[PDB]
């Protein structure tokens, strides 16, 4: 493991963690739970990083550009192996690991709220499954659903809310498409529909896309980061394990250049991964304009294979093994850290807290935060939906984390194109903010009856898990008592809003 950026595989809680979540205060019992999770680990999106590096390898073999015969053979074996794994799985598809991530999250979701769901099975409580409508998010949800149902012995299968707009009529029939809360970052919805002009959802997505496309600070900071000399040095360092100085020198002065075509040249034809059927897996045929024209390009492509390889752990087996981690050992691990920063920086600036003086990058998550609260109200107010399980994307989680002020997402970069986001000046990391299957879950409990002092019902209370670790809400929020991670619903409605005001003494039970 190491420096996987937002390709970090989900770290499931150990038995100690899962058995030690805090108990709600005396008199409070479960009434609702909800979640939003990023899809699980996926393979390569297309025949691209693996394609281009194989074209480079073929040229190195022809021109004597590998450091040794053993090194040549090992590099080609690694590339062939990851390509073969993707051809078999289908490019872009959920990996075995990605399925297991969601299966486990689903199992433990039932287990943590066994009392809630056993009551629901008896009382007619219903479960709502939602996705953005994107196939990998829905398929992640399907695995969560399988795990949840196995853990509960099928006793909640008859308790699923029928969607009014299902993801599909087959395996995804239980999933309601909700791209306003799970794909708020784009006008174009995954199902081929688009948000309607004049609606809040449209403006949120459109204003955001226009903002990031044209913002001078983001553009300048990204140029500064793209020109980073130490990343260029790390690129050379990484590649010199494999290729000769003479070969890499020709790359650095433009004598070598590879395109994603049949022969690696611009005049080559459209290519397809070996063994793939273009009609069944269109993503096995890459875009020809994709290219390697510098050491930076080749090294970042190699780094991308290293991080996806971790996500493809289950496919790293038998007749299609690969060992990209061997290029990132010892001093070379520090190169991985540089490449991780380069990737994290782009996400940070475009989708995360980004630079000080704006909130355009993450205010877009407001519809999801609104729904997190609104679905609690629906239940508290007499509704039958006891859980809402949502499945979405890194583009959903990153701004959601920043808007909530979750750990890791509390620091904006300076308002500067030169004094930029770095690992030394910012806590944000893809690996911890938005790993594969990243998720936020809230549990809601209530004390029954009317408070004799108010003649009204007791305020419900809420507790959060982030990647299945129990965490406090943001520091402005006051919990129900000293030493508690439970918070009044009234308090969250105040303290999670943009003013972040606490109700103070009125937050205490
Ligand atoms: Zn296989
Ligand atoms: Zn060198």
Author numbering: 7 to 515
Paper text:
To this end, crystals of the apoenzyme and of an inactive mutant in which the presumed catalytic proton donor Glu-401 was replaced by a glutamine (E401Q) were prepared, the latter in an attempt to trap the catalytic phosphohistidine intermediate. The structures of the apoenzyme and product complex were solved at 1.65 and 1.71 Å resolution, respectively, whereas a data set collected at 2.40 Å resolution from a crystal of the inactive E401Q mutant yielded a structure of the His-45 phosphohistidine derivative. Analysis of the resulting structures indicates that, unlike previously characterized HP2P, BlMINPP possesses an unusual inherent flexibility. In the apo-state the enzyme exists in an open conformation with many of the specificity pockets incompletely formed. On binding the substrate analog, the enzyme moves to a closed conformation where the full array of interactions with ligand are present. This movement is not limited to the active center, as is seen in E. coli AppA, but rather it propagates to a large region of the α-domain, which we will refer to as the molecular “lid,” which rotates on binding of substrate toward the α/β-domain. The lid comprises the majority of the α-domain residues, excluding only the residues of helices Ala-222–Ile-231 and Ala-337–Lys-357, which line one side of the active site cleft and the latter of which contributes residues to specificity pocket B. DynDom identified a maximum rotational movement of the lid of 18.1° upon ligand binding, corresponding to 82.3% closure of the moving domain. The α/β-domain and the remainder of the α-domain undergo only limited changes and are considered fixed (RMS deviation 0.55 Å).
